[PDB]
């Protein structure tokens, strides 16, 4: 990871992409999105996400949640997020053929492939990206003004 103690941003990314049977919460992803505007945190955040995406088989949740977070940051964080993804398109495209059938015969990998496929389509369509971002930013805005339960 090339860091001593993890920064708060790195801890948040790891938590959001933990190898656990649950997806990232919107509140946590929203915090990470704000952090993408911090010049130092941006680099730490992207580096950790690319690393969590670098995994296989039984660790598919790391990959799936990392893509979910990347998708969120592409649409809701600094524009530099989508810019770096476009520059490293190959690293997103490889996930389109990720495979994993668990020991019960359940294909978990197909969902990783589908998300990668749709994410790639989004990143290559500039007009869609602008629309998705406007809608995503409004959603984060609405989220911030909605009370708990």
UniProtKB/Swiss-Prot annotation:
BP GO terms, sorted: clathrin coat assembly; embryonic organ development; endocytosis; female pregnancy; in utero embryonic development; membrane fission; negative regulation of sprouting angiogenesis; Notch signaling pathway
Post-translational modification: Ubiquitinated. Phosphorylated on serine and/or threonine residues in mitotic cells. Phosphorylation reduces interaction with REPS2, AP-2 and the membrane fraction. Depolarization of synaptosomes results in dephosphorylation.
Compartments where located: Cytoplasm; Cell membrane; Nucleus; Membrane, Clathrin-coated pit
Gene Ontology molecular functions: clathrin adaptor activity; clathrin binding; molecular sequestering activity; phospholipid binding; transmembrane transporter binding
Main location: cytoplasm
Domain notes: The NPF repeat domain is involved in EPS15 binding.
Subunit annotation: Monomer. Binds ITSN1. Binds clathrin, ZBTB16/ZNF145, AP2A1 and AP2A2. Binds ubiquitinated proteins. Interacts with RALBP1 in a complex also containing NUMB and TFAP2A during interphase and mitosis. Interacts with AP2B1. Interacts with UBQLN2. Interacts with REPS2; the interaction is direct. Interacts with EPS15; the interaction is direct. Interacts with ENTREP1.
Name of the featured protein: Epsin-1
Organism: Rattus norvegicus
Gene responsible for this protein: Epn1
Boundaries of the shown chain within the full protein: 12 to 160 of 575
């Amino acid at each position: 990871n090339i860091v001593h103690n993890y920064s708060e941003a790195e801890i948040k990314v790891r938590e959001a992409t933990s190898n656990d049977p649950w997806g990232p919460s919107s509140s946590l992803m929203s915090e990470i999105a704000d952090l993408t505007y911090n010049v130092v945190a941006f680099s730490e955040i992207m580096s950790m996400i690319w690393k969590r995406l670098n995994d296989h088989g039984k660790n598919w949740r790391h990959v799936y949640k990392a893509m979910t977070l990347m998708e969120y940051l592409i649409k809701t964080g600094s524009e530099r997020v989508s810019q770096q993804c476009k520059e490293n398109m190959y690293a997103v495209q490889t996930l389109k053929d990720f495979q994993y059938v668990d020991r019960d015969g359940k294909d978990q990998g197909v969902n990783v492939r589908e998300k990668a496929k749709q994410l790639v389509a989004l990143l290559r369509d500039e007009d869609r990206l602008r629309e998705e971002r406007a809608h995503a930013l409004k959603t984060k805005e609405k989220l911030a003004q909605t009370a708990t339960a």
